[PDB]
């Protein structure tokens, strides 16, 4: 697993990053949340259970549970609301961590200086990630 | 028994006193903002649930729109001072969002003119000191109950509001629920 995800992660980790700053500085809230369903699952899936040693690949299967699990609906909701709004939602420009996980939006949102693809690839990097491992 | 922190409202951690009797931020930019007030007529409903003379209060907020973001607030400012909120509320909403016709201070200017506002009396209370002041009061209540986005209610500067701890398939119901929640919280 390691390299196939680390070769495709970086290229999307960075295809975000590379151009994050070159795309000037677009306004975005669900991004960090969605960049945390990435960099909180890939960056902890290589190093998840496929791991430094390869005989215990079910801890990732549980990080691959609360992974694009969210990563799906985060971008799935995100998209839904663009043309199909709601009274009950919001629209913001802010941090948050309900248990002090703070540095996470004073660095990956701080050091930042289309959804079409996100909505689908987050579900696409799921069923493929599900089938062959479950 | 059946009214819970974390559920229908989330209690404010850092309570601000000197607050309204119920604030209600919003932007002329957030569809959800629109929906909340144009598609559901929520304030009106909630007003009707409120007791004797509990100041329903409302503001507008900046972050979305930047340059116009501002103008709009002072657009509103006036509209608090004069009287007008009720009469500009919709046009402007429709103006910015739906009809896609607002662009500059002047475009807004005119939208007051039309609804029975005098092109000077507006500019005659635009720059006034009792509307530079109101403009702060807005940013300052907003930095003070730690707003991140919009819509958003707040009672007594002590309990935010939480729509998710409620139904979200039945509009008729989501409403009757929402309003109660504010009533209950107005006496606490
Ligand atoms: C995966 O989550 C998201 C991104 O990362 C690839 C984005 O770049 C963007 C757009 C980028 C900027 C700088 C607004 C959005 C909206 C997003 O939700």
mmCIF file of C-alpha atoms and ligand atoms in Angstrom:
data_model
loop_
_atom_site.group_PDB
_atom_site.id
_atom_site.type_symbol
_atom_site.label_atom_id
_atom_site.label_comp_id
_atom_site.label_asym_id
_atom_site.label_seq_id
_atom_site.Cartn_x
_atom_site.Cartn_y
_atom_site.Cartn_z
ATOM 1 C CA UNK A 1 0.000 0.000 0.000
ATOM 2 C CA UNK A 2 2.568 2.557 1.260
ATOM 3 C CA UNK A 3 3.917 3.920 -2.037
ATOM 4 C CA UNK A 4 0.759 3.656 -4.195
ATOM 5 C CA UNK A 5 -0.988 5.934 -1.674
ATOM 6 C CA UNK A 6 2.107 8.052 -0.890
ATOM 7 C CA UNK A 7 2.709 8.600 -4.646
ATOM 8 C CA UNK A 8 -0.980 9.480 -5.219
ATOM 9 C CA UNK A 9 -1.385 11.261 -1.858
ATOM 10 C CA UNK A 10 1.524 13.714 -2.348
ATOM 11 C CA UNK A 11 0.417 14.410 -5.945
ATOM 12 C CA UNK A 12 -3.004 15.420 -4.517
ATOM 13 C CA UNK A 13 -1.708 16.637 -1.157
ATOM 14 C CA UNK A 14 0.416 18.957 -3.289
ATOM 15 C CA UNK A 15 -1.913 19.468 -6.287
ATOM 16 C CA UNK A 16 -3.845 21.141 -3.512
ATOM 17 C CA UNK A 17 -0.713 22.668 -1.892
ATOM 18 C CA UNK A 18 1.422 23.423 -5.010
ATOM 19 C CA UNK A 19 -1.313 25.673 -6.309
ATOM 20 C CA UNK A 20 -3.054 26.601 -3.002
ATOM 21 C CA UNK A 21 -0.922 29.768 -3.153
ATOM 22 C CA UNK A 22 -0.714 29.966 -6.976
ATOM 23 C CA UNK A 23 -4.547 29.914 -7.030
ATOM 24 C CA UNK A 24 -4.078 33.311 -5.271
ATOM 25 C CA UNK A 25 -6.056 32.742 -2.007
ATOM 26 C CA UNK A 26 -9.666 31.576 -2.532
ATOM 27 C CA UNK A 27 -12.051 31.644 0.504
ATOM 28 C CA UNK A 28 -12.793 28.203 2.035
ATOM 29 C CA UNK A 29 -13.998 26.507 5.260
ATOM 30 C CA UNK A 30 -14.962 22.948 4.314
ATOM 31 C CA UNK A 31 -11.531 22.684 2.716
ATOM 32 C CA UNK A 32 -9.477 22.400 5.906
ATOM 33 C CA UNK A 33 -12.126 20.020 7.292
ATOM 34 C CA UNK A 34 -11.751 18.096 4.018
ATOM 35 C CA UNK A 35 -7.954 18.507 4.039
ATOM 36 C CA UNK A 36 -8.156 16.942 7.542
ATOM 37 C CA UNK A 37 -10.153 13.954 6.214
ATOM 38 C CA UNK A 38 -7.136 13.653 3.898
ATOM 39 C CA UNK A 39 -4.078 14.577 5.960
ATOM 40 C CA UNK A 40 -5.701 12.958 9.007
ATOM 41 C CA UNK A 41 -6.250 9.668 7.139
ATOM 42 C CA UNK A 42 -3.559 9.309 4.450
ATOM 43 C CA UNK A 43 -0.823 10.813 6.628
ATOM 44 C CA UNK A 44 -2.166 8.377 9.259
ATOM 45 C CA UNK A 45 -2.948 5.436 6.905
ATOM 46 C CA UNK A 46 0.498 4.901 5.389
ATOM 47 C CA UNK A 47 1.562 5.163 9.028
ATOM 48 C CA UNK A 48 -1.824 3.652 10.016
ATOM 49 C CA UNK A 49 -1.635 -0.169 10.031
ATOM 50 C CA UNK A 50 0.034 -1.120 6.740
ATOM 51 C CA UNK A 51 2.502 0.767 8.940
ATOM 52 C CA UNK A 52 6.303 0.512 9.352
ATOM 53 C CA UNK A 53 5.614 -3.286 9.596
ATOM 54 C CA UNK A 54 3.077 -5.043 7.328
ATOM 55 C CA UNK A 55 1.382 -7.890 9.369
ATOM 56 C CA UNK A 56 -1.293 -5.741 11.115
ATOM 57 C CA UNK A 57 -3.309 -3.968 8.394
ATOM 58 C CA UNK A 58 -6.649 -3.783 10.329
ATOM 59 C CA UNK A 59 -5.872 -0.669 12.442
ATOM 60 C CA UNK A 60 -5.795 1.202 9.121
ATOM 61 C CA UNK A 61 -9.022 -0.670 8.236
ATOM 62 C CA UNK A 62 -10.405 1.283 11.288
ATOM 63 C CA UNK A 63 -8.625 4.556 10.321
ATOM 64 C CA UNK A 64 -9.954 3.741 6.833
ATOM 65 C CA UNK A 65 -13.359 3.594 8.614
ATOM 66 C CA UNK A 66 -13.454 7.149 10.039
ATOM 67 C CA UNK A 67 -11.506 8.292 7.012
ATOM 68 C CA UNK A 68 -13.175 9.386 3.798
ATOM 69 C CA UNK A 69 -16.214 8.162 5.688
ATOM 70 C CA UNK A 70 -16.337 11.805 6.602
ATOM 71 C CA UNK A 71 -14.239 12.677 3.510
ATOM 72 C CA UNK A 72 -17.245 11.570 1.489
ATOM 73 C CA UNK A 73 -20.044 13.490 3.215
ATOM 74 C CA UNK A 74 -17.821 16.478 3.972
ATOM 75 C CA UNK A 75 -17.412 17.037 0.199
ATOM 76 C CA UNK A 76 -20.826 15.452 -0.498
ATOM 77 C CA UNK A 77 -22.540 18.032 1.792
ATOM 78 C CA UNK A 78 -20.211 20.819 0.559
ATOM 79 C CA UNK A 79 -21.377 20.179 -3.011
ATOM 80 C CA UNK A 80 -25.080 19.667 -2.215
ATOM 81 C CA UNK A 81 -25.300 23.146 -0.689
ATOM 82 C CA UNK A 82 -23.752 24.996 -3.661
ATOM 83 C CA UNK A 83 -26.957 24.857 -5.810
ATOM 84 C CA UNK A 84 -29.247 23.251 -3.202
ATOM 85 C CA UNK A 85 -29.239 25.417 0.007
ATOM 86 C CA UNK A 86 -30.841 24.947 3.402
ATOM 87 C CA UNK A 87 -32.190 27.080 6.221
ATOM 88 C CA UNK A 88 -30.660 24.911 8.944
ATOM 89 C CA UNK A 89 -26.983 25.144 7.895
ATOM 90 C CA UNK A 90 -24.445 28.006 8.069
ATOM 91 C CA UNK A 91 -21.527 29.482 6.037
ATOM 92 C CA UNK A 92 -18.365 30.634 7.851
ATOM 93 C CA UNK A 93 -14.602 31.384 7.769
ATOM 94 C CA UNK A 94 -13.150 29.708 10.873
ATOM 95 C CA UNK A 95 -11.081 27.217 12.873
ATOM 96 C CA UNK A 96 -12.313 24.873 15.572
ATOM 97 C CA UNK A 97 -11.304 21.896 17.757
ATOM 98 C CA UNK A 98 -13.752 20.711 20.481
ATOM 99 C CA UNK A 99 -10.920 19.292 22.704
ATOM 100 C CA UNK A 100 -7.831 21.467 21.966
ATOM 101 C CA UNK A 101 -6.255 20.099 18.792
ATOM 102 C CA UNK A 102 -5.374 23.682 17.993
ATOM 103 C CA UNK A 103 -2.133 24.008 15.936
ATOM 104 C CA UNK A 104 -4.084 22.308 13.102
ATOM 105 C CA UNK A 105 -5.585 25.613 11.908
ATOM 106 C CA UNK A 106 -2.658 27.816 12.808
ATOM 107 C CA UNK A 107 -0.504 25.824 10.362
ATOM 108 C CA UNK A 108 -2.346 23.985 7.463
ATOM 109 C CA UNK A 109 -4.848 26.898 7.083
ATOM 110 C CA UNK A 110 -2.103 29.393 8.094
ATOM 111 C CA UNK A 111 0.561 28.040 5.709
ATOM 112 C CA UNK A 112 -1.768 28.070 2.678
ATOM 113 C CA UNK A 113 0.036 31.193 1.302
ATOM 114 C CA UNK A 114 -12.540 22.150 -8.705
ATOM 115 C CA UNK A 115 -14.814 20.565 -6.066
ATOM 116 C CA UNK A 116 -16.208 18.616 -9.060
ATOM 117 C CA UNK A 117 -13.185 16.314 -8.701
ATOM 118 C CA UNK A 118 -13.174 16.277 -4.859
ATOM 119 C CA UNK A 119 -16.813 15.157 -4.473
ATOM 120 C CA UNK A 120 -16.160 12.064 -6.602
ATOM 121 C CA UNK A 121 -12.512 11.212 -5.824
ATOM 122 C CA UNK A 122 -13.272 11.175 -2.069
ATOM 123 C CA UNK A 123 -15.904 8.476 -2.705
ATOM 124 C CA UNK A 124 -13.765 6.908 -5.451
ATOM 125 C CA UNK A 125 -10.728 6.565 -3.159
ATOM 126 C CA UNK A 126 -13.206 4.869 -0.772
ATOM 127 C CA UNK A 127 -14.941 1.911 -2.513
ATOM 128 C CA UNK A 128 -11.601 0.956 -4.098
ATOM 129 C CA UNK A 129 -10.036 1.384 -0.630
ATOM 130 C CA UNK A 130 -12.879 -0.687 0.872
ATOM 131 C CA UNK A 131 -13.325 -3.632 -1.530
ATOM 132 C CA UNK A 132 -9.722 -4.931 -1.852
ATOM 133 C CA UNK A 133 -9.069 -4.634 1.929
ATOM 134 C CA UNK A 134 -12.428 -5.763 3.408
ATOM 135 C CA UNK B 1 -36.551 16.184 31.438
ATOM 136 C CA UNK B 2 -36.504 17.207 27.727
ATOM 137 C CA UNK B 3 -34.421 20.446 27.191
ATOM 138 C CA UNK B 4 -30.714 19.779 26.754
ATOM 139 C CA UNK B 5 -27.368 21.518 26.510
ATOM 140 C CA UNK B 6 -25.484 20.243 23.433
ATOM 141 C CA UNK B 7 -28.792 19.313 21.788
ATOM 142 C CA UNK B 8 -31.234 22.146 20.919
ATOM 143 C CA UNK B 9 -28.845 24.908 22.065
ATOM 144 C CA UNK B 10 -25.165 25.048 23.080
ATOM 145 C CA UNK B 11 -24.396 27.108 26.221
ATOM 146 C CA UNK B 12 -21.933 30.016 25.867
ATOM 147 C CA UNK B 13 -18.627 29.335 27.580
ATOM 148 C CA UNK B 14 -17.583 33.011 27.938
ATOM 149 C CA UNK B 15 -20.827 34.887 28.746
ATOM 150 C CA UNK B 16 -21.073 38.535 27.657
ATOM 151 C CA UNK B 17 -23.260 40.888 29.713
ATOM 152 C CA UNK B 18 -24.734 44.139 28.490
ATOM 153 C CA UNK B 19 -26.137 42.113 25.606
ATOM 154 C CA UNK B 20 -29.445 42.429 23.792
ATOM 155 C CA UNK B 21 -32.485 40.413 24.863
ATOM 156 C CA UNK B 22 -31.883 38.341 21.770
ATOM 157 C CA UNK B 23 -29.311 39.099 19.037
ATOM 158 C CA UNK B 24 -29.336 37.611 15.543
ATOM 159 C CA UNK B 25 -26.426 38.023 13.146
ATOM 160 C CA UNK B 26 -26.763 37.404 9.380
ATOM 161 C CA UNK B 27 -25.313 38.487 6.059
ATOM 162 C CA UNK B 28 -26.925 39.711 2.800
ATOM 163 C CA UNK B 29 -24.846 37.038 1.107
ATOM 164 C CA UNK B 30 -25.454 33.688 2.803
ATOM 165 C CA UNK B 31 -28.234 31.899 0.978
ATOM 166 C CA UNK B 32 -28.846 30.140 4.283
ATOM 167 C CA UNK B 33 -29.156 33.648 5.637
ATOM 168 C CA UNK B 34 -31.704 34.331 2.926
ATOM 169 C CA UNK B 35 -33.475 31.000 3.378
ATOM 170 C CA UNK B 36 -33.649 31.508 7.140
ATOM 171 C CA UNK B 37 -35.524 34.773 6.828
ATOM 172 C CA UNK B 38 -36.898 34.874 3.275
ATOM 173 C CA UNK B 39 -37.800 31.209 2.730
ATOM 174 C CA UNK B 40 -39.024 30.498 6.322
ATOM 175 C CA UNK B 41 -39.919 33.920 7.701
ATOM 176 C CA UNK B 42 -38.292 32.794 11.069
ATOM 177 C CA UNK B 43 -37.858 36.050 13.018
ATOM 178 C CA UNK B 44 -41.523 36.934 12.498
ATOM 179 C CA UNK B 45 -42.599 33.572 13.931
ATOM 180 C CA UNK B 46 -40.173 33.816 16.820
ATOM 181 C CA UNK B 47 -41.282 37.406 17.570
ATOM 182 C CA UNK B 48 -44.774 35.987 18.029
ATOM 183 C CA UNK B 49 -43.508 33.403 20.534
ATOM 184 C CA UNK B 50 -41.606 36.045 22.531
ATOM 185 C CA UNK B 51 -43.182 37.445 25.741
ATOM 186 C CA UNK B 52 -44.147 41.042 26.565
ATOM 187 C CA UNK B 53 -41.661 43.425 24.964
ATOM 188 C CA UNK B 54 -38.629 41.194 24.725
ATOM 189 C CA UNK B 55 -36.422 43.223 22.379
ATOM 190 C CA UNK B 56 -35.978 41.065 19.321
ATOM 191 C CA UNK B 57 -32.752 42.515 17.858
ATOM 192 C CA UNK B 58 -30.787 41.832 14.692
ATOM 193 C CA UNK B 59 -27.451 42.821 13.162
ATOM 194 C CA UNK B 60 -25.536 42.301 9.925
ATOM 195 C CA UNK B 61 -21.947 40.945 9.427
ATOM 196 C CA UNK B 62 -18.860 41.702 7.439
ATOM 197 C CA UNK B 63 -16.530 38.972 6.458
ATOM 198 C CA UNK B 64 -18.440 37.871 3.306
ATOM 199 C CA UNK B 65 -18.212 40.497 0.480
ATOM 200 C CA UNK B 66 -15.282 42.424 2.042
ATOM 201 C CA UNK B 67 -15.557 45.882 0.430
ATOM 202 C CA UNK B 68 -19.324 45.743 -0.006
ATOM 203 C CA UNK B 69 -19.393 43.692 3.180
ATOM 204 C CA UNK B 70 -18.811 46.956 4.955
ATOM 205 C CA UNK B 71 -21.004 49.433 2.995
ATOM 206 C CA UNK B 72 -23.875 46.987 3.621
ATOM 207 C CA UNK B 73 -23.456 47.144 7.409
ATOM 208 C CA UNK B 74 -23.608 50.975 7.322
ATOM 209 C CA UNK B 75 -26.325 50.559 4.823
ATOM 210 C CA UNK B 76 -27.986 48.678 7.652
ATOM 211 C CA UNK B 77 -26.714 50.927 10.347
ATOM 212 C CA UNK B 78 -28.830 53.767 8.953
ATOM 213 C CA UNK B 79 -31.727 51.374 8.655
ATOM 214 C CA UNK B 80 -31.602 50.684 12.361
ATOM 215 C CA UNK B 81 -31.324 54.349 13.239
ATOM 216 C CA UNK B 82 -33.969 55.739 10.878
ATOM 217 C CA UNK B 83 -36.560 52.980 11.281
ATOM 218 C CA UNK B 84 -36.565 51.411 7.833
ATOM 219 C CA UNK B 85 -35.036 47.852 8.544
ATOM 220 C CA UNK B 86 -38.436 46.292 7.816
ATOM 221 C CA UNK B 87 -38.786 48.188 4.531
ATOM 222 C CA UNK B 88 -35.224 47.644 3.201
ATOM 223 C CA UNK B 89 -34.790 44.084 4.543
ATOM 224 C CA UNK B 90 -36.243 42.336 1.514
ATOM 225 C CA UNK B 91 -35.334 44.614 -1.415
ATOM 226 C CA UNK B 92 -31.674 44.555 -0.375
ATOM 227 C CA UNK B 93 -31.736 40.792 0.149
ATOM 228 C CA UNK B 94 -33.272 40.259 -3.211
ATOM 229 C CA UNK B 95 -30.975 43.032 -4.393
ATOM 230 C CA UNK B 96 -27.643 41.445 -3.516
ATOM 231 C CA UNK B 97 -28.478 37.756 -3.789
ATOM 232 C CA UNK B 98 -31.404 36.841 -5.997
ATOM 233 C CA UNK B 99 -31.870 39.643 -8.541
ATOM 234 C CA UNK B 100 -28.039 40.064 -8.808
ATOM 235 C CA UNK B 101 -28.392 43.820 -9.314
ATOM 236 C CA UNK B 102 -26.371 45.380 -6.421
ATOM 237 C CA UNK B 103 -22.698 46.280 -6.930
ATOM 238 C CA UNK B 104 -21.799 49.726 -5.471
ATOM 239 C CA UNK B 105 -22.745 51.968 -2.544
ATOM 240 C CA UNK B 106 -24.863 53.922 -5.025
ATOM 241 C CA UNK B 107 -26.777 50.831 -6.162
ATOM 242 C CA UNK B 108 -27.679 50.392 -2.464
ATOM 243 C CA UNK B 109 -28.241 54.101 -1.934
ATOM 244 C CA UNK B 110 -31.017 53.952 -4.542
ATOM 245 C CA UNK B 111 -32.619 50.871 -2.976
ATOM 246 C CA UNK B 112 -33.256 52.944 0.099
ATOM 247 C CA UNK B 113 -34.459 55.905 -2.009
ATOM 248 C CA UNK B 114 -37.111 53.717 -3.640
ATOM 249 C CA UNK B 115 -38.589 52.250 -0.405
ATOM 250 C CA UNK B 116 -39.486 55.698 0.920
ATOM 251 C CA UNK B 117 -36.092 57.067 1.986
ATOM 252 C CA UNK B 118 -34.925 60.606 1.218
ATOM 253 C CA UNK B 119 -31.631 60.677 -0.759
ATOM 254 C CA UNK B 120 -30.204 63.273 1.618
ATOM 255 C CA UNK B 121 -31.782 62.099 4.923
ATOM 256 C CA UNK B 122 -30.016 58.803 4.264
ATOM 257 C CA UNK B 123 -26.675 60.561 3.574
ATOM 258 C CA UNK B 124 -27.665 62.930 6.392
ATOM 259 C CA UNK B 125 -27.730 60.016 8.845
ATOM 260 C CA UNK B 126 -25.233 57.803 6.919
ATOM 261 C CA UNK B 127 -22.242 59.820 8.117
ATOM 262 C CA UNK B 128 -23.843 60.796 11.410
ATOM 263 C CA UNK B 129 -22.168 59.942 14.642
ATOM 264 C CA UNK B 130 -25.061 57.822 15.800
ATOM 265 C CA UNK B 131 -24.380 55.552 12.837
ATOM 266 C CA UNK B 132 -20.605 55.356 13.060
ATOM 267 C CA UNK B 133 -21.290 54.238 16.611
ATOM 268 C CA UNK B 134 -23.913 51.656 15.716
ATOM 269 C CA UNK B 135 -21.440 50.212 13.191
ATOM 270 C CA UNK B 136 -18.946 49.379 15.925
ATOM 271 C CA UNK B 137 -21.687 47.985 18.288
ATOM 272 C CA UNK B 138 -22.080 45.418 15.474
ATOM 273 C CA UNK B 139 -18.513 44.319 15.003
ATOM 274 C CA UNK B 140 -18.182 44.458 18.835
ATOM 275 C CA UNK B 141 -21.121 42.199 19.693
ATOM 276 C CA UNK B 142 -19.805 39.887 16.966
ATOM 277 C CA UNK B 143 -16.244 39.579 18.197
ATOM 278 C CA UNK B 144 -17.774 39.144 21.680
ATOM 279 C CA UNK B 145 -19.883 36.025 21.224
ATOM 280 C CA UNK B 146 -17.161 34.647 19.124
ATOM 281 C CA UNK B 147 -18.929 34.394 15.793
ATOM 282 C CA UNK B 148 -17.456 32.203 13.090
ATOM 283 C CA UNK B 149 -20.411 32.167 10.606
ATOM 284 C CA UNK B 150 -24.047 32.921 9.689
ATOM 285 C CA UNK B 151 -27.024 32.802 10.366
ATOM 286 C CA UNK B 152 -26.771 32.391 14.165
ATOM 287 C CA UNK B 153 -28.932 33.421 17.103
ATOM 288 C CA UNK B 154 -27.971 34.132 20.731
ATOM 289 C CA UNK B 155 -30.201 34.644 23.751
ATOM 290 C CA UNK B 156 -29.355 36.942 26.659
ATOM 291 C CA UNK B 157 -25.713 36.816 25.513
ATOM 292 C CA UNK B 158 -25.550 33.453 27.230
ATOM 293 C CA UNK B 159 -26.937 30.647 25.035
ATOM 294 C CA UNK B 160 -26.079 30.338 21.362
ATOM 295 C CA UNK B 161 -28.612 28.490 19.180
ATOM 296 C CA UNK B 162 -28.413 25.050 17.675
ATOM 297 C CA UNK B 163 -30.698 23.988 14.779
ATOM 298 C CA UNK B 164 -29.275 20.447 14.548
ATOM 299 C CA UNK B 165 -30.701 19.424 17.906
ATOM 300 C CA UNK B 166 -34.081 19.637 16.104
ATOM 301 C CA UNK B 167 -35.992 18.110 13.161
ATOM 302 C CA UNK B 168 -34.558 18.650 9.682
ATOM 303 C CA UNK B 169 -37.138 17.147 7.318
ATOM 304 C CA UNK B 170 -40.346 18.986 8.362
ATOM 305 C CA UNK B 171 -40.208 22.742 7.838
ATOM 306 C CA UNK B 172 -43.553 23.416 9.536
ATOM 307 C CA UNK B 173 -42.116 21.573 12.585
ATOM 308 C CA UNK B 174 -38.442 22.732 12.576
ATOM 309 C CA UNK B 175 -40.037 26.148 12.932
ATOM 310 C CA UNK B 176 -42.457 25.483 15.849
ATOM 311 C CA UNK B 177 -39.524 23.756 17.583
ATOM 312 C CA UNK B 178 -36.987 26.581 16.925
ATOM 313 C CA UNK B 179 -39.247 29.289 18.350
ATOM 314 C CA UNK B 180 -40.132 27.458 21.549
ATOM 315 C CA UNK B 181 -36.402 26.961 22.190
ATOM 316 C CA UNK B 182 -35.922 30.757 22.238
ATOM 317 C CA UNK B 183 -38.977 31.316 24.478
ATOM 318 C CA UNK B 184 -37.819 28.716 27.038
ATOM 319 C CA UNK B 185 -34.367 30.350 26.922
ATOM 320 C CA UNK B 186 -35.703 33.913 27.305
ATOM 321 C CA UNK B 187 -36.676 33.076 30.907
ATOM 322 C CA UNK B 188 -33.623 31.268 32.375
HETATM 323 C C1 LIG C 1 -10.482 18.771 -0.415
HETATM 324 O O1 LIG C 1 -11.030 20.027 0.056
HETATM 325 C C2 LIG C 1 -10.928 21.216 -0.652
HETATM 326 C C3 LIG C 1 -9.648 21.574 -1.355
HETATM 327 O O2 LIG C 1 -8.556 20.735 -1.322
HETATM 328 C C4 LIG C 1 -8.230 19.915 -2.454
HETATM 329 C C5 LIG C 1 -9.542 22.858 -2.107
HETATM 330 O O3 LIG C 1 -8.464 23.113 -2.683
HETATM 331 C C6 LIG C 1 -10.700 23.810 -2.175
HETATM 332 C C7 LIG C 1 -10.582 25.118 -2.943
HETATM 333 C C8 LIG C 1 -9.288 25.851 -2.591
HETATM 334 C C9 LIG C 1 -9.274 27.096 -2.077
HETATM 335 C C10 LIG C 1 -7.956 27.763 -1.758
HETATM 336 C C11 LIG C 1 -10.565 27.824 -1.820
HETATM 337 C C12 LIG C 1 -11.987 23.458 -1.484
HETATM 338 C C13 LIG C 1 -13.183 24.387 -1.523
HETATM 339 C C14 LIG C 1 -12.102 22.174 -0.719
HETATM 340 O O4 LIG C 1 -13.194 21.927 -0.135
#
